[PDB]
Scaffold this active site. Sequence first.
Site, PDB file in Angstrom:
ATOM      1  N   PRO B  35       0.832  -1.519  -0.042  1.00 18.91           N
ATOM      2  CG  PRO B  35      -0.193  -0.671   2.189  1.00 18.91           C
ATOM      3  CD  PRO B  35       0.591  -1.588   1.097  1.00 18.91           C
ATOM      4  CG  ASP B  36       2.100   4.984  -2.610  1.00 22.52           C
ATOM      5  OD1 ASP B  36       3.397   4.760  -2.092  1.00 22.52           O
ATOM      6  OD2 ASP B  36       2.100   5.671  -3.647  1.00 22.52           O
ATOM      7  CG  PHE B  37       4.469   5.513   1.162  1.00 23.55           C
ATOM      8  CD1 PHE B  37       4.784   4.391   0.596  1.00 23.55           C
ATOM      9  CD2 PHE B  37       4.887   6.888   1.259  1.00 23.55           C
ATOM     10  CE1 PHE B  37       6.137   4.754  -0.068  1.00 23.55           C
ATOM     11  CE2 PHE B  37       5.523   6.914   0.758  1.00 23.55           C
ATOM     12  CZ  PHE B  37       6.570   5.904  -0.516  1.00 23.55           C
ATOM     13  NE  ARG B  38       3.853   8.444  -3.309  1.00 20.80           N
ATOM     14  CZ  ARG B  38       5.113   8.208  -4.692  1.00 20.80           C
ATOM     15  NH1 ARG B  38       6.213   9.604  -5.094  1.00 20.80           N
ATOM     16  NH2 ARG B  38       4.965   7.759  -5.408  1.00 20.80           N
ATOM     17  CG  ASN B 109      11.139  -2.473  -4.567  1.00 18.88           C
ATOM     18  OD1 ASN B 109       9.731  -1.224  -4.544  1.00 18.88           O
ATOM     19  ND2 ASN B 109      10.687  -3.585  -5.749  1.00 18.88           N
ATOM     20  CG  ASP B 111       8.760  -4.400  -1.713  1.00 12.39           C
ATOM     21  OD1 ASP B 111      10.245  -4.777  -2.084  1.00 12.39           O
ATOM     22  OD2 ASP B 111       8.515  -4.418  -2.374  1.00 12.39           O
ATOM     23  CB  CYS B 163      25.622   6.261  22.153  1.00 15.51           C
ATOM     24  SG  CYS B 163      24.288   6.232  20.807  1.00 15.51           S
TER      25      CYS B 163
HETATM   26  N1  LIG Z   1       7.949  -1.210  -3.209  1.00 22.82           N
HETATM   27  C1  LIG Z   1       8.529  -1.039  -1.915  1.00 22.82           C
HETATM   28  O1  LIG Z   1       8.606  -1.247  -1.044  1.00 22.82           O
HETATM   29  C2  LIG Z   1       8.229   0.826  -2.107  1.00 22.82           C
HETATM   30  C3  LIG Z   1       6.344   1.112  -2.343  1.00 22.82           C
HETATM   31  C4  LIG Z   1       6.164   2.191  -2.885  1.00 22.82           C
HETATM   32  C5  LIG Z   1       7.865   3.075  -2.563  1.00 22.82           C
HETATM   33  N2  LIG Z   1       8.745   2.513  -2.699  1.00 22.82           N
HETATM   34  C6  LIG Z   1       9.833   3.816  -2.436  1.00 22.82           C
HETATM   35  O2  LIG Z   1       9.457   5.102  -3.442  1.00 22.82           O
HETATM   36  C7  LIG Z   1      10.241   5.200  -4.722  1.00 22.82           C
HETATM   37  C8  LIG Z   1       9.501   5.264  -5.598  1.00 22.82           C
HETATM   38  O3  LIG Z   1      10.405   5.319  -6.972  1.00 22.82           O
HETATM   39  P1  LIG Z   1       9.485   3.090  -7.352  1.00 22.82           P
HETATM   40  O4  LIG Z   1       9.951   4.839  -8.983  1.00 22.82           O
HETATM   41  O5  LIG Z   1      10.079   2.944  -7.522  1.00 22.82           O
HETATM   42  O6  LIG Z   1       8.378   3.648  -7.546  1.00 22.82           O
HETATM   43  P2  LIG Z   1       7.460   4.586  -8.533  1.00 22.82           P
HETATM   44  O7  LIG Z   1       5.481   4.658  -7.250  1.00 22.82           O
HETATM   45  O8  LIG Z   1       7.250   6.224  -8.497  1.00 22.82           O
HETATM   46  O9  LIG Z   1       6.962   4.198  -9.959  1.00 22.82           O
HETATM   47  C9  LIG Z   1       6.401   2.948 -10.363  1.00 22.82           C
HETATM   48  C10 LIG Z   1       5.665   2.555 -11.443  1.00 22.82           C
HETATM   49  O10 LIG Z   1       4.800   1.579 -11.670  1.00 22.82           O
HETATM   50  C11 LIG Z   1       4.417   1.481 -12.551  1.00 22.82           C
HETATM   51  N3  LIG Z   1       3.233   0.760 -11.902  1.00 22.82           N
HETATM   52  C12 LIG Z   1       2.938   0.377 -10.773  1.00 22.82           C
HETATM   53  N4  LIG Z   1       2.147  -0.272 -10.811  1.00 22.82           N
HETATM   54  C13 LIG Z   1       1.789  -1.169 -12.014  1.00 22.82           C
HETATM   55  C14 LIG Z   1       1.198  -2.864 -12.570  1.00 22.82           C
HETATM   56  N5  LIG Z   1       0.204  -3.380 -11.713  1.00 22.82           N
HETATM   57  N6  LIG Z   1       1.168  -2.718 -13.595  1.00 22.82           N
HETATM   58  C15 LIG Z   1       1.931  -1.810 -14.796  1.00 22.82           C
HETATM   59  N7  LIG Z   1       2.540  -1.041 -13.938  1.00 22.82           N
HETATM   60  C16 LIG Z   1       2.867  -0.504 -12.197  1.00 22.82           C
HETATM   61  C17 LIG Z   1       3.883   3.261 -12.143  1.00 22.82           C
HETATM   62  O11 LIG Z   1       2.692   3.528 -13.168  1.00 22.82           O
HETATM   63  C18 LIG Z   1       5.202   3.727 -12.210  1.00 22.82           C
HETATM   64  O12 LIG Z   1       5.172   4.381 -12.716  1.00 22.82           O
HETATM   65  C19 LIG Z   1      11.642   4.490  -4.747  1.00 22.82           C
HETATM   66  O13 LIG Z   1      12.488   5.989  -3.456  1.00 22.82           O
HETATM   67  C20 LIG Z   1      11.344   2.873  -3.255  1.00 22.82           C
HETATM   68  O14 LIG Z   1      12.356   2.813  -2.349  1.00 22.82           O
HETATM   69  C21 LIG Z   1       9.366   1.425  -2.002  1.00 22.82           C
HETATM   70  C1  LIG Z   2       2.531  14.570  -8.400  1.00 26.09           C
HETATM   71  C2  LIG Z   2       2.405  13.806  -6.952  1.00 26.09           C
HETATM   72  C3  LIG Z   2       1.663  14.575  -5.810  1.00 26.09           C
HETATM   73  C4  LIG Z   2       2.650  15.017  -4.504  1.00 26.09           C
HETATM   74  C5  LIG Z   2       3.592  16.495  -5.672  1.00 26.09           C
HETATM   75  O1  LIG Z   2       3.019  17.080  -6.512  1.00 26.09           O
HETATM   76  C6  LIG Z   2       4.170  18.024  -6.640  1.00 26.09           C
HETATM   77  C7  LIG Z   2       4.508  19.024  -7.996  1.00 26.09           C
HETATM   78  C8  LIG Z   2       5.486  19.548  -7.917  1.00 26.09           C
HETATM   79  C9  LIG Z   2       5.760  19.329  -7.101  1.00 26.09           C
HETATM   80  C10 LIG Z   2       6.280  18.705  -5.721  1.00 26.09           C
HETATM   81  C11 LIG Z   2       5.139  17.694  -5.812  1.00 26.09           C
HETATM   82  C12 LIG Z   2       4.616  17.448  -5.330  1.00 26.09           C
HETATM   83  C13 LIG Z   2       5.421  16.610  -3.565  1.00 26.09           C
HETATM   84  O2  LIG Z   2       4.904  17.188  -3.243  1.00 26.09           O
HETATM   85  C14 LIG Z   2       6.425  16.039  -4.556  1.00 26.09           C
HETATM   86  C15 LIG Z   2       6.671  14.652  -5.318  1.00 26.09           C
HETATM   87  C16 LIG Z   2       7.662  14.182  -5.219  1.00 26.09           C
HETATM   88  I1  LIG Z   2       7.448  12.578  -6.933  1.00 26.09           I
HETATM   89  C17 LIG Z   2       8.426  14.654  -4.449  1.00 26.09           C
HETATM   90  O3  LIG Z   2      10.130  13.393  -4.625  1.00 26.09           O
HETATM   91  C18 LIG Z   2       9.759  13.103  -4.382  1.00 26.09           C
HETATM   92  C19 LIG Z   2       9.044  11.196  -4.806  1.00 26.09           C
HETATM   93  N1  LIG Z   2       9.481   9.689  -3.709  1.00 26.09           N
HETATM   94  C20 LIG Z   2       9.835   9.602  -4.088  1.00 26.09           C
HETATM   95  C21 LIG Z   2      10.941   9.237  -5.189  1.00 26.09           C
HETATM   96  C22 LIG Z   2       8.549  10.052  -2.033  1.00 26.09           C
HETATM   97  C23 LIG Z   2       7.217   9.033  -1.864  1.00 26.09           C
HETATM   98  C24 LIG Z   2       9.056  15.359  -3.828  1.00 26.09           C
HETATM   99  I2  LIG Z   2      10.142  16.181  -2.397  1.00 26.09           I
HETATM  100  C25 LIG Z   2       7.662  16.217  -3.733  1.00 26.09           C
HETATM  101 ZN   LIG Z   3      24.333   4.499  19.970  1.00 22.64          ZN
END
Ligand SMILES: NC(=O)c1ccc[n+]([C@@H]2O[C@H](COP(=O)([O-])OP(=O)(O)OC[C@H]3O[C@@H](n4cnc5c(N)ncnc54)[C@H](O)[C@@H]3O)[C@@H](O)[C@H]2O)c1
Ligand SMILES: CCCCc1oc2ccccc2c1C(=O)c1cc(I)c(OCCN(CC)CC)c(I)c1
Ligand SMILES: [Zn+2]
Lengths: 4, 271
Positions: B35-38, B109, B111, B163
């Site tokens: 699940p995406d925290f965001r 990732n 996870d 510490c």
């Molecule tokens: N699984 C995890 O541990 C996890 C999950 C979310 C975010 N993160 C962290 O946050 C950041 C996210 O960056 P990122 O580029 O890896 O993830 P992201 O969410 O930025 O991008 C994921 C990409 O995969 C695609 N996608 C997702 N589900 C899909 C499906 N069912 N079929 C086809 N495409 C699909 C999306 O359209 C997107 O383009 C990283 O720094 C990462 O460490 C990690």
């Molecule tokens: C489109 C996603 C909504 C949140 C968001 O939209 C923006 C548009 C312009 C500038 C910033 C944002 C914004 C953010 O606040 C935002 C988005 C990202 I993607 C971002 O980069 C970190 C993204 N990610 C790790 C790859 C954190 C989960 C940061 I810092 C801030």
């Molecule tokens: Zn320590």
Amino acid sequence: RHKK
Amino acid sequence: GKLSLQDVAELIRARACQRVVVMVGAGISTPSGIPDFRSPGSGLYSNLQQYDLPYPEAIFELPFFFHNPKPFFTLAKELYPGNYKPNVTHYFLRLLHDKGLLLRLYTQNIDGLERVSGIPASKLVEAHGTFASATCTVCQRPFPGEDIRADVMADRVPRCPVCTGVVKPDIVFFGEPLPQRFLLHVVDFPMADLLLILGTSLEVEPFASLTEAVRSSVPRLLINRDLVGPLAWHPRSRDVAQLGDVVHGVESLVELLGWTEEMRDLVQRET
Ligand SMILES: NC(=O)c1ccc[n+]([C@@H]2O[C@H](COP(=O)([O-])OP(=O)(O)OC[C@H]3O[C@@H](n4cnc5c(N)ncnc54)[C@H](O)[C@@H]3O)[C@@H](O)[C@H]2O)c1
Ligand SMILES: CCCCc1oc2ccccc2c1C(=O)c1cc(I)c(OCCN(CC)CC)c(I)c1
Ligand SMILES: [Zn+2]
Ligand SMILES: *Nc1ccc2c(C)cc(=O)oc2c1
Ligand SMILES: [Mg+2]
């Protein structure tokens, strides 16, 4: 260099 | 594109491409039910709205952790290996490895489910960290996840036994430099003869650019909803995009390779  | 999906199956079958580097996002975890925290609607967004979270980025913001880390430890708890299964899309990947084909699995990732699908530690580059190992956010002392799992599951905020700092898993938080394992990209990407991007949106850097660190003789494959990233700005002469749902593309691909039964049995064995 490579940060998150 | 001159190259289809079968072509990519046949090359693998014939054993032309033998060291496949794979780049996986959240696309493959969706159908596990992560699940995406965001997402204003997912399973975990409702529980974290009671909690102190202004924007979703806050949880992996280091400052905000020190005010209120319980939404991270409420997340972690909800993710801690045991809650969720891996799906086909992982077992496919594990089968690459079983078949001596996976060079390295770079993952966004957090996870844990790649390892759950039975891939070794060494084949992974958990780019945004892991819920395996911990590290104290004061003294930096490293601990096994088990140590600091006992605390999370019970509703205690873990603290270093020496510490007293709040002990944090090795998830990468916004700003933190990527694991030293990431440094492998240097060797793996120019040492790859198949690029396979499984369900990732390719917005964020660096992870995207690495699509181009491969060699221009090398085919790049993309299984995903849509054509995104440096494929969608700089495509090349050997690219293929299985454009659609990731799972079904993995189900077609498997089939065109001829790993039906071995996929059928693996998944029966592991579950
Ligand atoms: N699984 C995890 O541990 C996890 C999950 C979310 C975010 N993160 C962290 O946050 C950041 C996210 O960056 P990122 O580029 O890896 O993830 P992201 O969410 O930025 O991008 C994921 C990409 O995969 C695609 N996608 C997702 N589900 C899909 C499906 N069912 N079929 C086809 N495409 C699909 C999306 O359209 C997107 O383009 C990283 O720094 C990462 O460490 C990690
Ligand atoms: C489109 C996603 C909504 C949140 C968001 O939209 C923006 C548009 C312009 C500038 C910033 C944002 C914004 C953010 O606040 C935002 C988005 C990202 I993607 C971002 O980069 C970190 C993204 N990610 C790790 C790859 C954190 C989960 C940061 I810092 C801030
Ligand atoms: Zn320590
Ligand atoms: N890795 C990472 C960390 C922090 C970021 C902020 C704060 C903004 C952004 O646009 O990208 C980031 C990437
Ligand atoms: Mg302890």
